[PDB]
């Protein structure tokens, strides 16, 4: 799609994570975990730059993943990805990058947004990190 190759690869990993954890749906949480674990990925350094502890974030995200029902993208994920698209359009980006997911997730309510807020993320410090 309009997604960067790195973002597409993280999505594939998110699917593997959901499968490996016996979850029926790939949730924004799965993608965040994949992005946090992506060597050379943009998400971890973006968070560190925004003043958010990426290490503790993956722990809280893993805790949330551990709470999901066990038994394929969820509508939650489709929704957040749609906002990523709109955000890329508003910022004038040619493609949808991983950093936008952090911003879109923060503005999409639900568990991931709650975790990000508690971790110190705000539309302001994430947007600043993105522009930087």
Curated annotation (Swiss-Prot):
Q: Changing residue 87 to Q: reported impact?
A: 75% decrease in chaperone activity; retains ATPase activity
- Subcellular compartments: Cytoplasm
Q: List the residue ranges of the region (Repeat 2).
A: 73-132
Consequence when changing residue 83 to Q: Loss of chaperone activity. Retains ATPase activity
Induction comment: By heat shock and other environmental stresses.
Q: Where is the Clp R domain?
A: 1-132
Effect recorded for residue 4 to A: Loss of chaperone activity
Question: Changing residue 93 to A: what effect?
Answer: Loss of chaperone activity
Give the region (Repeat 1) as residue ranges: 3-68
Record annotation: effect of changing residue 99 to A: Loss of chaperone activity
Query: Which residues carry the post-translational modification N6-acetyllysine, per the record?
Result: 86
- What is this protein's function per UniProt? Part of a stress-induced multi-chaperone system, it is involved in the recovery of the cell from heat-induced damage, in cooperation with DnaK, DnaJ and GrpE. Acts before DnaK, in the processing of protein aggregates. Protein binding stimulates the ATPase activity; ATP hydrolysis unfolds the denatured protein aggregates, which probably helps expose new hydrophobic binding sites on the surface of ClpB-bound aggregates, contributing to the solubilization and refolding of denatured protein aggregates by DnaK.
Additional remarks? One peptide binds per ClpB hexamer; the binding site is formed only upon ATP-driven oligomerization.
* Annotated family: Belongs to the ClpA/ClpB family.
Its UniProt domain note says:
The Clp repeat (R) domain probably functions as a substrate-discriminating domain, recruiting aggregated proteins to the ClpB hexamer and/or stabilizing bound proteins. The NBD2 domain is responsible for oligomerization, whereas the NBD1 domain stabilizes the hexamer probably in an ATP-dependent manner. The movement of the coiled-coil domain is essential for ClpB ability to rescue proteins from an aggregated state, probably by pulling apart large aggregated proteins, which are bound between the coiled-coils motifs of adjacent ClpB subunits in the functional hexamer.
Give the multimer and partner information: Homohexamer. The oligomerization is ATP-dependent.
Q: What is this protein called?
A: Chaperone protein ClpB
Naturally occurring in which organism (per UniProt) = Escherichia coli (strain K12)
Portion held of the full protein = 4 to 142 of 857
């Amino acid at each position: 799609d309009r997604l960067t190759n790195k973002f597409q690869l993280a999505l594939a990993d998110a699917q593997s994570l959901a499968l490996g954890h016996d979850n029926q749906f790939i949730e924004p949480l799965h993608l965040m975990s994949a992005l946090l674990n992506q060597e050379g990925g943009s998400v971890s350094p973006l968070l560190t730059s925004a003043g958010i502890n990426a290490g503790q974030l993956r722990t809280d995200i893993n805790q949330a993943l551990n709470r999901l029902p066990q038994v394929q993208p969820s509508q939650d994920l489709v929704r957040v990805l749609n906002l990523c698209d709109k955000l890329a359009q508003k910022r004038g980006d040619n493609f949808i990058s991983s950093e936008l997911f952090v911003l879109a997730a923060l503005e999409s309510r639900g568990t991931l947004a709650d975790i990000l807020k508690a971790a110190g993320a705000t539309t302001a410090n994430i947007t600043q990190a993105i522009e930087q």
